[PDB]
Amino acid sequence: AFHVEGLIAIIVFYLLILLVGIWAAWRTRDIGLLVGGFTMTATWVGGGYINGTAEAVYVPGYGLAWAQAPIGYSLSLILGGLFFAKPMRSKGYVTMLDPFQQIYGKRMGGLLFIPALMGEMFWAAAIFSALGATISVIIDVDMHISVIISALIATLYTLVGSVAYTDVVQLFCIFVGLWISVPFALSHPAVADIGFTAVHAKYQKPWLGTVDSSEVYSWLDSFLLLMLGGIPWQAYFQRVLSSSSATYAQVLSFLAAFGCLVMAIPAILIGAIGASTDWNQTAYGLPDPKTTEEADMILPIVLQYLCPVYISFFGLGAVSAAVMSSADSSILSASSMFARNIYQLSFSDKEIVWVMRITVFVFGASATAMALLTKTVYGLWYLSSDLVYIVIFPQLLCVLFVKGTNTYGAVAGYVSGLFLRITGGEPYLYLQPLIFYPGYYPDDNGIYNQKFPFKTLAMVTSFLTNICISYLAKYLFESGTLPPKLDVFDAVVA
């Protein structure tokens, strides 16, 4: 059942956004602070953000209490503005890896680039999965072909090619579409009372969620993963260092956190509506999306099957076009980081452009393949911050706040963090945990899952190992136990 009208809607809204950007460039009370706050909010908020929030609220075992990524990233923005924006702007860095390049050298920064590249790839895979889900819902095509086509269009749009203040228009379109679809979705006769199902169970488990007494250590272990893992991203620090003054950067960070908190509310409402929906009354029919293994597509479904045809047309086409336009930002950030940091220095402007094109194509292909293999948006969203939290965040803390850090401590903390992360086991990769922390339980798949906060323990172990090995190596080279010819990374001598 191919839908021509949905394709017309997404094309019309995409071109409307494009000509609004052209008009804004054509034009070019001091309201630039609010515009900057909107533009910084639009970096995090997108298809992946709202789709992951709706999926996390929708899934019966997790609910709202486990939908920690929006709140965690808002608190990450607040913490960045409070504590990290000022020291980064004090020393005048250009990119996020520049402190790593200056302190640990180019090689160890190259090793640090791999978790950052993996996190950007996971984030882009989540964005592509959400975009393909929305497009496959509006046009009613197969999920895989929709994902491949949308990723191809985004890759070619990045490859070739105005475009001024487009992020503000994208965020406004997302906001208007979601907040117009919500009142019509709430009034659908299939949807039950949203307040009643928050604390009561009629179709599935209550969407508020419950946390057991034993899970409190794990829940915090997850929450600190999202609150602290969302800080070291390149896209945020680019905007922080682009700001004129440090106080201006702090105010933009606070406004972006407030905007993220506001934009999380319609996604939570859509997830709650999907949790409360009786799908027999709708045109979707049994089985429900969770039995269809289409839970990660809950936001496009609710906007499509619980809203009138004109409201669905307008709002969901606007959301589709805004997500499609905002899908490629992570591609540009990761590819620019690849061109600037590791290729130009560690590994001609025409060569830079050619490598830019090649790495955009490779990043897009890897992201769309990873989107094809996975079956969730919030899972990729959470796993994107995992390696950043384990690896990048302790190194960022050491370079910014710890005086006297070395490449020895960097390497030791890297190895310790990877060891404690891998030996804890990954249920997604069917990796058996080598170290059996107390409280371990077996899931349905037969793989043992850790309930102990081993990820936060890995982060703290990496940080303490960095500090301890750095100062121990300083003492060894000062006292004369190890000669200056023995060193490999030459951290002490330089």
Q: In angstroms, what is the minimal distance from the CB of 151 to ligand A1AOW?
A: 18
Residue 188 corresponds to which amino acid?
A: H
207-226: contacts with ligand A1AOW (CB under 6 A): 222
CA–CA gap between residue 424 and residue 401 (Å, rounded): 28
Residues 6+ apart with CB under 8 A from 4: none
Q: In angstroms, what is the minimal distance from the CB of 441 to ligand A1AOW?
A: 13
> What per-residue string of b and e applies to 372-395 under the rule 16 or more CB within 10 Å gives b?
bebebbbbbbbbbbbbbbbbbbbb
Residue 289 interacting with ligand A1AOW (CB under 6 A): no
Contact 65, 220 (CB under 8 A): no
Q: In angstroms, what is the minimal distance from the CB of 140 to ligand A1AOW?
A: 23
Q: In angstroms, what is the minimal distance from the CB of 115 to ligand A1AOW?
A: 17
| Residue nearer to ligand A1AOW on the CB measure, 168 or 226 | 226
Quickly tell me which residue has 């922080």 as its tokens: 240
Residue 379 interacting with ligand A1AOW (CB under 6 A): yes
CA–CA gap between residue 341 and residue 99 (Å, rounded): 11
| Residue nearer to ligand A1AOW on the CB measure, 271 or 315 | 271
- Side-chain-facing half-sphere of 413: CA atoms under 13 Å: 34
Q: H or E stretch including 79?
A: helix 69-79
CA–CA gap between residue 377 and residue 381 (Å, rounded): 6
Residue 375 interacting with ligand A1AOW (CB under 6 A): yes
How many chain residues are in contact with ligand A1AOW, going by CB under 6 A? Answer: 15
One residue of 376, 395, 466, 470 binding ligand A1AOW per CB under 6 A: 376
Q: In angstroms, what is the minimal distance from the CB of 428 to ligand A1AOW?
A: 4
**Segment lying near ligand A1AOW (by CB under 6 A), choices 354-362, 375-383, 404-412, 484-492:** 375-383
| Residue nearer to ligand A1AOW on the CB measure, 333 or 376 | 376
Question: Residue 319 has which token pair?
Answer: 């959301």
Question: Phi first, then psi: what are they for 326, rounded to 5°?
Answer: -95, 10
Return the SS3 of 99.
helix
One residue of 38, 49, 66, 84 binding ligand A1AOW per CB under 6 A: 66
Residue 59 interacting with ligand A1AOW (CB under 6 A): yes
Q: Which of 407, 395, 398 is nearest to 488 (CA)?
A: 407
Q: In angstroms, what is the minimal distance from the CB of 379 to ligand A1AOW?
A: 4
Q: In angstroms, what is the minimal distance from the CB of 354 to ligand A1AOW?
A: 33
| Residue nearer to ligand A1AOW on the CB measure, 17 or 59 | 59
Q: Which of 299, 197, 236 is nearest to 96 (CA)?
A: 236
Q: In angstroms, what is the minimal distance from the CB of 61 to ligand A1AOW?
A: 8
Residues 6+ apart with CB under 8 A from 94: 241, 340
One residue of 14, 44, 49, 62 binding ligand A1AOW per CB under 6 A: 62
Count Cβ atoms below 10 Å from residue 53 Cβ, excluding itself. 30
| Residue nearer to ligand A1AOW on the CB measure, 66 or 414 | 66
CA–CA gap between residue 336 and residue 369 (Å, rounded): 21
One residue of 233, 382, 393, 477 binding ligand A1AOW per CB under 6 A: 382
Q: In angstroms, what is the minimal distance from the CB of 381 to ligand A1AOW?
A: 8
Burial class (CB in 10 A: 0-12, 13-18, 19+), 435: middle
Q: In angstroms, what is the minimal distance from the CB of 444 to ligand A1AOW?
A: 12
| Residue nearer to ligand A1AOW on the CB measure, 21 or 271 | 271
Helix, strand, coil content of the chain in percent (nearest 5): 70, 0, 30
Residue 267 interacting with ligand A1AOW (CB under 6 A): no
One residue of 56, 138, 141, 306 binding ligand A1AOW per CB under 6 A: 56
What track of x and - describes contact with ligand A1AOW for positions 405 through 444 (by CB under 6 A)?
Answer: -----------------------x----------------
Contact 110, 89 (CB under 8 A): no
Going by the DSSP 8-state scheme, the letter that residue 161 receives in this structure is -
- By CB under 6 A, name the binding residues for ligand A1AOW: 55-56, 59, 62, 66, 222, 374-376, 378-380, 382-383, 428
